[PDB]
Amino acid sequence: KYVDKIHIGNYEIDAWYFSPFPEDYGKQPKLWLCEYCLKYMKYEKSYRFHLGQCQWRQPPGKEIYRKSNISVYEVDGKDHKIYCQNLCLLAKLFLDHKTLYFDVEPFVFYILTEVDRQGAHIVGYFSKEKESPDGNNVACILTLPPYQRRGYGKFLIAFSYELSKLESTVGSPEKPLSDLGKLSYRSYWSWVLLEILRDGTLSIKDLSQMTSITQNDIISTLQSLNMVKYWKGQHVICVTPKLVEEHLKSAPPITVDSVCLKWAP
Numbered sequence: 377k378y379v380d381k382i383h384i385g386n387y388e389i390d391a392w393y394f395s396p397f398p399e400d401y402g403k404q405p406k407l408w409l410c411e412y413c414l415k416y417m418k419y420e421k422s423y424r425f426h427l428g429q430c431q432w433r434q435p436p437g438k439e440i441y442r443k444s445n446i447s448v449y450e451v452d453g454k455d456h457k458i459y460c461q462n463l464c465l466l467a468k469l470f471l472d473h474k475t476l477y478f479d480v481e482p483f484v485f486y487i488l489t490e491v492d493r494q495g496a497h498i499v500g501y502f503s504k505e506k507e508s509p510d511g512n513n514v515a516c517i518l519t520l521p522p523y524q525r526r527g528y529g530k531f532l533i534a535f536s537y538e539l540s541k542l543e544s545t546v547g548s549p550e551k552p553l554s555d556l557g558k559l560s561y562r563s564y565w566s567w568v569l570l571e572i573l574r575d576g577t578l579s580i581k582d583l584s585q586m587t588s589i590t591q592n593d594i595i596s597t598l599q600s601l602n603m604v605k606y607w608k609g610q611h612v613i614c615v616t617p618k619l620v621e622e623h624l625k626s627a628p629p630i631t632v633d634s635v636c637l638k639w640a641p
């Protein structure tokens with residue numbers, strides 16, 4: 377029997393996929409997680425004990441972003457092998473895919489939290505290879521189910537590209553994306569490109585430099601917006617400023633503010 381339900385903070389969440397917690401953890405009805413340290417437990421009683429004992433009120437690592445009550449924590453999988461191992465076991469419940477939980481050292485994880493008087497509550501995250509051969513700025517990304525479709529996912533994407541901009545480099549997420557992933561990326565890419573086309577003869581490589589979005593990713597977005605033509609084996613941006621505004625006017629809640637970022641490579 378696999379883990380099929382978890383309790384974390386005040387949420388219970390049914391599982392979507394196999395996650396390889398140790399066998400005897402699968403045995404139990406629920407898995408219980410501390411929402412701050414992400415320790416997993418077998419019973420409500422050991423859960424309750426831990427709750428009144430645990431001193432953590434936030435993720436470990438560095439708070440590299442604070443706007444209002446939104447915070448992002450940078451955790452090095454080398455500094456905190458266990459927390460990150462726990463994070464990955466948690467994420468694998470909802471990511472079909474994921475392939476890596478135990479080897480976490482090569483990764484750095486970014487934890488989105490929304491803060492109240494009690495502490496900083498994890499909402500989603502994205503991991504990132506410290507050194508990427510394939511140029512992926514986002515190894516795995518996810519918003520916890522009860523928080524999905526509210527702009528947190530798109531906030532994370534925005535954020536992963538802000539880091540790329542500060543590294544003066546372009547990146548794409550590692551594939552395959554989930555269907556929610558595809559949608560969110562295509563939506564983010566669209567918004568960013570349309571917003572910029574509103575404000576005169578930019579090349580695709582120019583757009584690529586400004587946004588840190590790869591050329592393939594810009595091209596494929598522009599195709600779906602119907603704003604690129606094919607000429608002699610070359611993708612050519614064909615934009616009518618009345619179809620930019622036209623697309624914008626058509627049908628995120630939370631956005632990355634470069635000022636409130638506290639980072640450097």
Ligand SMILES: [Cl-]
Pocket residue numbers: 388389390521
């Ligand atoms: Cl659920």
Ligand SMILES: [Cl-]
Pocket residue numbers: 421422423425426
């Ligand atoms: Cl305990």
Ligand SMILES: [Zn+2]
Pocket residue numbers: 410411412413414415426430431432
């Ligand atoms: Zn804890």
